[PDB]
């Protein structure tokens, strides 16, 4: 049973999952749109959108939290200097997912995920 549980295992262990979404969150902030599998995209929302919410309040402590969660200073700078202000009046929902068919190699269901003002 998994009654009321949240989060996808994605056939990984916990440290792999955490590292993967740290990399993928960085790619989405950097490129503003990426293509990935539909389940990974849905999981990425719960990682990236709290980072943008954090970036709405610029302070030393918040930059350090964001650095702790991304480990990339170029990503932290873009979060606080660009994305935070771009989304300052939006109450959540900073990303959108667009389904785009099936991967050739393994028939995986694919999707684009982008920032909503891209």
């Amino acid at each position: 049973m998994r009654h009321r549980k949240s989060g996808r295992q994605l056939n990984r262990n916990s440290s792999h999952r955490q590292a993967m979404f740290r990399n993928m969150a960085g790619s989405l902030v950097r490129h503003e749109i990426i293509k990935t599998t539909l389940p990974k995209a849905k999981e990425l929302r719960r990682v990236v959108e709290p980072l943008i919410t954090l970036a709405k309040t610029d302070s030393v402590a918040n930059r350090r939290l964001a650095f702790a969660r991304t480990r990339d200073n170029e990503i932290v700078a873009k979060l606080f200097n660009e994305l935070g202000p771009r989304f300052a009046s939006r109450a959540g929902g900073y990303t959108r997912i667009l389904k785009c068919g099936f991967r050739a190699g393994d028939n995986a269901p694919m999707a684009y995920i982008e920032l909503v003002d891209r």
């Binding site: 749109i33 667009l98 389904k99 785009c100 068919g101 684009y112």
Partner: protein
């Protein structure tokens, strides 16, 4: 564990009576580009619900 008797071609067909594929019920038509596409998916040219969502 293994069969004691060779199953027949009739029984083989009966087992496969659930194997047939189902075609997509119907495709959707983009209101701007007129392309057909899987419902709730973008078109081959990058439209969704009438908006050019992605380049190429």
């Amino acid at each position: 564990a293994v069969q004691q008797n060779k199953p027949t071609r009739s029984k083989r067909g009966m087992r496969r009576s659930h194997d047939a594929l189902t075609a997509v019920t119907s495709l959707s038509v983009d209101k701007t580009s007129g392309e057909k596409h899987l419902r709730h998916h973008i078109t081959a040219d990058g439209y969704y619900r009438g908006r050019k969502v992605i380049a190429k």
